[PDB]
Paper text:
The heterologous expression of the POD genes from the [name] genome, and subsequent kinetic studies, reveal a peroxidase array consisting of three VPs and six MnPs. The VP1 and MnP4 crystal structures were solved as representative for the two POD families present in the [name] genome. The overall structure of VP1 and MnP4 showed a heme group dividing the protein into a distal largely helical domain (formed by four main helices and two to three small ones) with one structural calcium ion, and a proximal domain composed by another six helices and a non-ordered region stabilized by a second calcium ion. The site where this takes place is conserved and comprises three acidic residues (E36/E40/D175 in VP1 and E36/E40/D181 in MnP4) located near the heme propionate occupying the most internal position with respect to the main access channel.
Residue numbers in the entry: 2 to 338
Write the structure that this text describes.
Amino acid sequence: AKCSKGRTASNDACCVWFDVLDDIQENLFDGGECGEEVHESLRLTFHDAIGFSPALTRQGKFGGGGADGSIMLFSDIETNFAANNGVDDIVEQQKPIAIKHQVSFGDFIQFAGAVGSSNCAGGPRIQFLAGRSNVTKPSPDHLVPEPFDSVTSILARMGDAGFKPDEVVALLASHSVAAQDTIDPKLAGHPFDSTPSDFDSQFFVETLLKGTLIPGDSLHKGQVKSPLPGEFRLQSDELLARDSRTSCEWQSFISNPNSMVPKFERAMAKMATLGQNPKKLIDCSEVIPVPRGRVKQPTLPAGKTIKDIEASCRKAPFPRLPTDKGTFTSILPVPSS
Ligand code: HEM
Ligand SMILES: [Ca+2]
Ligand SMILES: [Ca+2]
């Protein structure tokens, strides 16, 4: 079928997504940038989708509808869940965009995440399926993992939703393009790695460094010491990098950086369709832009050495990496407005 601006798609019902693409790229994402709005949009895909629990369903309780737009339609309820702190900003920005284009909240949330991530240097090109219904119910509370949850708790929660430990690690490649706002509000915008617009392996490297710094006046719930000026570290990321259930796969994205994009893409296709049947949706994947940027060689930060890495994979040593020359420059906070 013929879409706008000389574009085409096998399925006429994908054509609307080209118009949503143009709008969110030019406006929400300020000209195709991998900045704040993209980071928030990518986080939102998880906070919508993870509200899904077969365990609750089998005990005769509502388990959540997964990737169903519930966090948006029922934003009054869901954004007041503790685990959903700092989410309403992006939800209230996206809501009128989805309404104006008359696309479903669930589809829009996943679309904004897929388009957004494709703008990041070396980013993924996530599968995009359309057709999720708005008719659903608010997610139960306590289904979103928290940064102070144990690795046992996180893996069990993610396992219930459908993800193996390796897949949890893959999904956390998202933290390569990511900052915090609510754990330590005064340090809003301090990112989880040195390259928050580059979909690279620096997150996996830098979380394995020894925690040495309290960046603000104190530590806060869900935070641990960071290894570099300007960086923020989550307690969960630190535990996951070191825990024997996950440490080898954590290190695998450093030993084999080319695997990060394909494994993230596969895990995200799954997460974006929680509570849905793909065979009853339509495939509009071709609307997602092709990402640009080569796979980067992960490097140790300036002034750090291999002694600063807390290597945690029993079966295989940490890979030999180059070390950046000179002294370390504080990592810039992510802009936002
Ligand atoms: C597995 C357990 C996870 C935990 C405990 C966790 C925890 C967190 C926390 C505490 C923040 C900072 C929130 C704030 O204070 O502003 C954050 C940010 C973020 N999360 Fe995760 N997360 C998890 C998994 C994921 C997944 C699966 C995704 C998506 C694939 C994701 C995407 C993001 C992104 C893109 C940000 C940055 C948001 C921004 O820049 O404002 N996270 N996460
Ligand atoms: Ca949901
Ligand atoms: Ca990065």
